[PDB]
C-alpha cells in the first residue's frame, strides 16, 4: 500500500467524495457517516 | 450508471429500532443493515431540491462563528414519510438503492487501509474530546478537555504530516468548521479508538 491516498484525487469521476454535508441539530452523525460512504461507493462500483 | 447523493433524511427518520434513536444518536453498523434490507433513496441538502427526500433539519455553525444561527445540540427526529418531494420521479418505492452486504473491518491499520483502498470511504467513530471541537488543521491528537460523546464520520485516505501518521476525515459539520469540513486524525495506535468501529459494505449492482 501507497504511504499516502487520498480517496478525492482516485476517484475523480465521483464529486460526493469531495463533497461536506451539513447534520443540522440533531445527533444523526451515525447516518451522515453511512449515506456519505454508501454515495462514494455507488458511484464507484457502477456496475459490472 | 449511479452517481446519486444517498439520503441522510431516509436513513434518520425511517431506520427506526435497529439504527438506534434517531437524533439521539445510533449504531453505524445498523444503518448499513439498513441499506441492505430496505434501501436509502436519493436527497441532497438541506432545500437544494435535489432527489426524493432532501435533509430536511436547517444547517447551522458547528462550534464557530459563522453566518448561519448556532446548532442547539440535537432536536427532534423528523417522521418517516415514504415519499418524495413534489416534482420529482421516480417514485419513493422505485428510487431505493439497495446495497448486497454489510460488514465489519477489523482494528487494524492495514486492513483498513486495504479496504478504503480498493473498496472506497468507510465509516467510523471516535470518542470527542473538548479540543476537538477547535480543530483547524494538522494532525489532531487529543491533549485534554472533557469527554463529549462518540461521534460517527467518514475516512477516505491516509497520508503523513511532518512524520506524523494520520486518517484523511469529512466531518458532517459543514465546511466553515476544521480543514473545510474535513480533518486529520493520528493514525495506527487507535487514537480515541478511531480504528474500533470501521464498518462498510458493497452496493448491489
Ligand atoms: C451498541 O452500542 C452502544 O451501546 C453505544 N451506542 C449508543 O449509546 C448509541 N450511539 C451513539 O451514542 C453514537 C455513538 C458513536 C460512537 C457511534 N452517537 C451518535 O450517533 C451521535 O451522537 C453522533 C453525533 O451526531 N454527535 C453529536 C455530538 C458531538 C459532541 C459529537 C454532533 O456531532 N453534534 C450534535 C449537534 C450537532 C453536532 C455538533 O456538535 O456540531
Redesign the interface.
Known sequence: ????????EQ?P?????K?????????????????????????????? | ????????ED??TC?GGE??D???????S???NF?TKKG?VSGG??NSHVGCRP?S????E?HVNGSRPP???????PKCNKTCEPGYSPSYKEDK?F?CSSYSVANNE?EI??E??K???????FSVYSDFLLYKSGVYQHVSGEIMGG????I?????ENGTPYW?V??????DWGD???FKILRGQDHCGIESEI?????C?
Open positions: 500500500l501507497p504511504e499516502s491516498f487520498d480517496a478525492r476517484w469521476n465521483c464529486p460526493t467524495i463533497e461536506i454535508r451539513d447534520q443540522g441539530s440533531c445527533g444523526s452523525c451515525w447516518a451522515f457517516g453511512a449515506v456519505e460512504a454508501i454515495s462514494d461507493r455507488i458511484c464507484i462500483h457502477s456496475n459490472g | 450508471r449511479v452517481n446519486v447523493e444517498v439520503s441522510a436513513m434518520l431506520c439504527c438506534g434517531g437524533c439521539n444518536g445510533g449504531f453505524p445498523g444503518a448499513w441499506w436509502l441538502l438541506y435533509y433539519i436547517p444547517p447551522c458547528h446548532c442547539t445540540g440535537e432536536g427532534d427526529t438503492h446495497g492495514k487501509m486495504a478504503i483502498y473498496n472506497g470511504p468507510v465509516e467510523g467513530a461521534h460517527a464520520i467518514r477516505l485516505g491516509w497520508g503523513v484523511l469529512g466531518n458532517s459539520w459543514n465546511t473545510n469540513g474535513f464498518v462498510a459494505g458493497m452496493p449492482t
